[PDB]
Amino acid sequence: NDESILLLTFLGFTGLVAKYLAPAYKDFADARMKKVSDVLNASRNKHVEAVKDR
Amino acid sequence: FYFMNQLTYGFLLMITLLILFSQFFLPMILRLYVSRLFISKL
Amino acid sequence: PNAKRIANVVHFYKSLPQGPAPAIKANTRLARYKAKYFDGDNASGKPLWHFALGIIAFGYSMEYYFHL
Amino acid sequence: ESLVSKELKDLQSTLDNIQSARPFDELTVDDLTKIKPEIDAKVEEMVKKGKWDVPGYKDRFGNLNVM
Amino acid sequence: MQLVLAAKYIGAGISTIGLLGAGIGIAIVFAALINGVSRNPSIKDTVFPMAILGFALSEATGLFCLMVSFLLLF
Amino acid sequence: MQLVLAAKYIGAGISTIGLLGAGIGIAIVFAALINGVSRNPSIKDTVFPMAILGFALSEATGLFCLMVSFLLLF
Amino acid sequence: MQLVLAAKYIGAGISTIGLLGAGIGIAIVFAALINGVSRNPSIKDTVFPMAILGFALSEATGLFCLMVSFLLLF
Amino acid sequence: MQLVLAAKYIGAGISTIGLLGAGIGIAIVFAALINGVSRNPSIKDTVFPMAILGFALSEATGLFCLMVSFLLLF
Amino acid sequence: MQLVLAAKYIGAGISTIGLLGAGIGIAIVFAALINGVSRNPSIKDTVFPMAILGFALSEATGLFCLMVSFLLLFG
Amino acid sequence: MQLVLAAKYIGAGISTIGLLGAGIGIAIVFAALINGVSRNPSIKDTVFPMAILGFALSEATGLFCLMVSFLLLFG
Amino acid sequence: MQLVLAAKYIGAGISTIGLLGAGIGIAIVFAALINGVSRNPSIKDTVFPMAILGFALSEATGLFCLMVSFLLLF
Amino acid sequence: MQLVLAAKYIGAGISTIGLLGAGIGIAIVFAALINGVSRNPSIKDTVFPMAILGFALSEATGLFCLMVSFLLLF
Amino acid sequence: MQLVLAAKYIGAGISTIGLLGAGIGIAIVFAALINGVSRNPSIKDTVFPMAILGFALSEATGLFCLMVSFLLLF
Amino acid sequence: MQLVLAAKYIGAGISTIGLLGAGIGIAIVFAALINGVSRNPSIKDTVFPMAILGFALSEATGLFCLMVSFLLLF
Amino acid sequence: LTTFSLYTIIVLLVITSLYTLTNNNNKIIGSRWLISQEAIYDTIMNMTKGQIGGKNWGLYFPMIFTLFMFIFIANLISMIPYSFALSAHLVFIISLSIVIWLGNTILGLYKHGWVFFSLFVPAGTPLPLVPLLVIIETLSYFARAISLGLRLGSNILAGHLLMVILAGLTFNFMLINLFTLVFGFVPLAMILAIMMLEFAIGIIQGYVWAILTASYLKDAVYL
Amino acid sequence: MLKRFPTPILKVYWPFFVAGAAVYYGMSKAADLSSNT
């Protein structure tokens, strides 16, 4: 093919997000889904303290 | 030329995709927000 | 006062107790998209990568059918 | 004098429903609609008015934006 | 036939010099950026979107040039 | 006879050099924005409708070098 | 004969390098407005009419682009 | 007979690039005014005559770039 | 012999094209005056002649080429 | 047809005026670097690489002009 | 002579564009003067003779310029 | 028949205009240095070799615009 | 034999813009002169050894402003 | 072997317009030199060597500019 | 048959089946392949809040969202290489943009009507100011239409036009010799350095369309 | 599957519903016989 370079010009652009930008989003979002999954839980334990007064 | 041919379903694609957002796919996460409110204030 | 202390007494009690019935035993080519790569374990650049590996095949074929 | 005395277990049955009956983060959302239908009722009233900005979200959660 | 085509080439050369302003247009939106970052290092979270839509308006408007010259190349 | 059809677009090809009026015309306004918010942050939402009112009167005023090409191209 | 309108097409298309300063004239007047109101926010009520005053005395002649270009093409 | 007004239509546009100096010369006169009066809003009362005798001589060249461009009218 | 007169037609076009130097130069001196008297009014009658001295001396690139450029009409 | 190969020969030098934006565009971004770090030396590595990302777009305009001349060069 | 020595009139028209840098040097040494006497008024009449040589020295290119414009006239 | 090898001498001498791009360019970085260490003479041992990086990177577009002038030799 | 060698006094008009931005060149050190000495009046006797003697170091370039003009003129 | 003698004359003269970069670049190297010694008089010999580096950086571009006229003139 | 609408039905296929893979059967936790969709959701919630702000605010919010995600996934065709693009087919974009130009003015008809002449100057004016600047600002109104869609259509087709001209250069630089691979590696990742910025342009060209459309229905809706 | 909601579409995008028919018909005066050069 005369245009053989065409699929080749992201040999490393596909590798850029695989090596340099894989934790730049996957290890960005995991703490955020960690953040919601306990600030509901810790406030739920505040319900276990609010039910103890009455 | 043939400017007409893609435009027939060009912006016709818009008025069916808005309704998938404005009625179906956009507000499905707003329930996902307010469920995080009725677990916030309990 | 009493009102927040009684707005919880239904929805804290009447829900599911165990997080049971995992519903991963529902495989009829409707949920079999996500039990392979969309489980919460790996998180690499995989489901985007197999999107492009088909459309470059869908791209190269349509001139192989047209002219080549 | 003992009017609330027969309310001696309705909060105690919840306490046993919290020490080993808390699946708060592996359960879904539409079960809560079967639990509380009013969480969809204010959804309907905040859609027709055009109130997508839910108040009481930013004080507890982030914006999750690129700002 | 090539006496009229001989000016299509000289147009497409002289046309694509109006985007020398596309370089320097995409420059002072960064030279005036880090004067902000040096004078207030806690504003970089919100001043970055003001210039990332800053130059995209600029360097595309300089990119109007080769949209004309490619018509006069092809 | 048709040898002046070349003069139709070489007169149009040089008309893209008038785009630096929008090449720099919206660079420095945004370069006057992104430092002008860093000097005091809480006037972000007052000068930003001032800027779009200054943006569109500058690049669209530098846009109609495109029209003298297109009615010359067609 | 034929060479009349050829001589008009490279003169009318070369008039649109003339609006180049007219584009970046709009830039610097809107530059120092959002740099002038930036430290004094209590001045937009008074000097923003002075900023737009810099068009009706200024671009009333500064935008003679097609007025010199297509004018004798009637 | 094809050189009745042969080189007249071309020169009237290439002469009309002097509106660059008439463009941004019509600009800094107000652009230096506005951040100047943003330093001191009390001096606005005395530059109301200085924008008179600052701008009118600034576009003295503005009449001098079109009367040269009016070689063709009369 | 109207070929050279056609050249003096277009050569009149690049004759007094050089008013950019007297176009932004005639304003940048006033860009310094009006930012000068802004910061202090106690020079209001000192440099106002001296920027007038900047005014006419900036037009030495203005009306210099013009004396044969406006006079190539009759001769 | 040696006029078109003259026409694909005259136009490279008329398409390289547009480089001069990139000749100075990489410097005025560098101009804000050195007086950038002069106000604080503790900013030295949080403004260095982003203005190189601020630099890199300015080169592509100058790398938009060389490909025009080279497509004008090769046939 | 009609094609040989008559050609030199357009060589003069490109000789008289060299004064665009002349008009700035008889402006910006004036422009640093008025701000130079701003923050120090009592340096006035020592700098005012050291700056008028800047009017003479910068315009020396503006006056050596158009000698080649009048080399072909007289 | 002489014309293709005739454009070898107009097609390169017009190509060396943009060598001023490094000319005014490469000194601006030096024009940043000598008033940059005015306000702070201490930190120069690390910020000077980073300016040579700017010296060398804009010198690369100080030889590109003479690269095609030496393509004349082939 | 008459229409070719006549161009040596035609391209000798284009070299009047060689570096004859004295306003961009020669004058801006005299601006920086009376900028600096209006900050320290007691320093002007050490800056003339580096400004006006530095001026010829700038006009070492300006030696050949028009040496290429007259050499192919007479 | 006719008109190629004209193109080595006209194209030689345009090459010196590129010496503007050597002219202006040899100006800001001193126009930023002396405002630096104005604020800090005592600390001088840390930049006077690197200024002639900046001058040699600027004049290398102009000396890689003008000699292409006399590249293959004979 | 239709030989140019081959992948237009893919464009809504990625978002009629976005719920298939993002929403993990309606969990409130919102895992990693979903939390971007709410990350991209609030990035339009913020910007149209800060420059509309009034009471009648979120009513046009779905339209200004569905313009974003429609051209945000224009980047798919700029990286799939063996394809003649749909954003390169600029006749549809510049005619999608003609309806959003006049559609606000016809939204200004029954809402505002006779007061809509107040585009002259939003500040004070004497007599000679207004009647000769009104043509200067409506020059930003009857050319407001073409200025939007062309900007998208001109920046993105160079994603396959400023790059396919290099493919004629580097494939011609390889079929010369085996010892022609000199001067370092220019027919290599230097081209990759060119491509990813236009790839990143494809993100910010969508985001600039959200901002640009947001500013126009601020004054066409509010007084 | 999904939930439907009565979201206000016609009474607020009726200019853009009308304007879709405005440019479509404009091509019936442009792509009838004026496209055969």
Residue numbers in the entry:
A (entry chain Z): 53 to 106
B (entry chain 8): 7 to 48
C (entry chain U): 19 to 86
D (entry chain 7): 107 to 173
E (entry chain S), F (entry chain T), G (entry chain K), H (entry chain L), K (entry chain N), L (entry chain Q), ...: 1 to 74
I (entry chain M), J (entry chain R): 1 to 75
O (entry chain X): 26 to 248
P (entry chain J): 1 to 37
What text does the study give?
The ATP synthase comprises a catalytic F1 portion, a peripheral stalk or stator, and the membrane embedded, Fo region. Fo contains a ring of c-subunits (eight in mammals, ten in yeast, 14 in chloroplast, and various stoichiometries in bacteria) that functions as a proton turbine, along with a-subunit that provides the conduits for proton entry and exit. The c-ring, connected to the central stalk of F1, rotates driven by the movement of protons down the potential gradient from the cytosol of the cell to the mitochondrial matrix, and the proton flow provides the energy for the phosphorylation of ADP in the active site of F1.
To improve the Fo structure, we reprocessed the cryo-EM data starting from particle picking at the center of Fo, instead of F1Fo. A unique and strong cryo-EM density is clearly observed at the interface between the a- and c-subunits, whose size and shape are consistent with those of a BDQ molecule. The binding of BDQ disrupted the interface between the a- and c-subunits as compared to the reference structures. Helices 5 and 6 of subunit-a are distorted around the proposed binding site of BDQ which increases the space between subunit-a and the c10-ring. The side chain of aMet215 is on the face of the helix closest to the BDQ molecule, and would clash with the EM density of BDQ if it was in the reference conformation. For instance, the phenyl ring of cPhe55 is displaced by as much as 3.1 Å and accompanied by distortion of the α-helix. The cation-π interaction between the t-amine of BDQ and cPhe64 is likely to be a critical interaction that stabilizes BDQ binding.
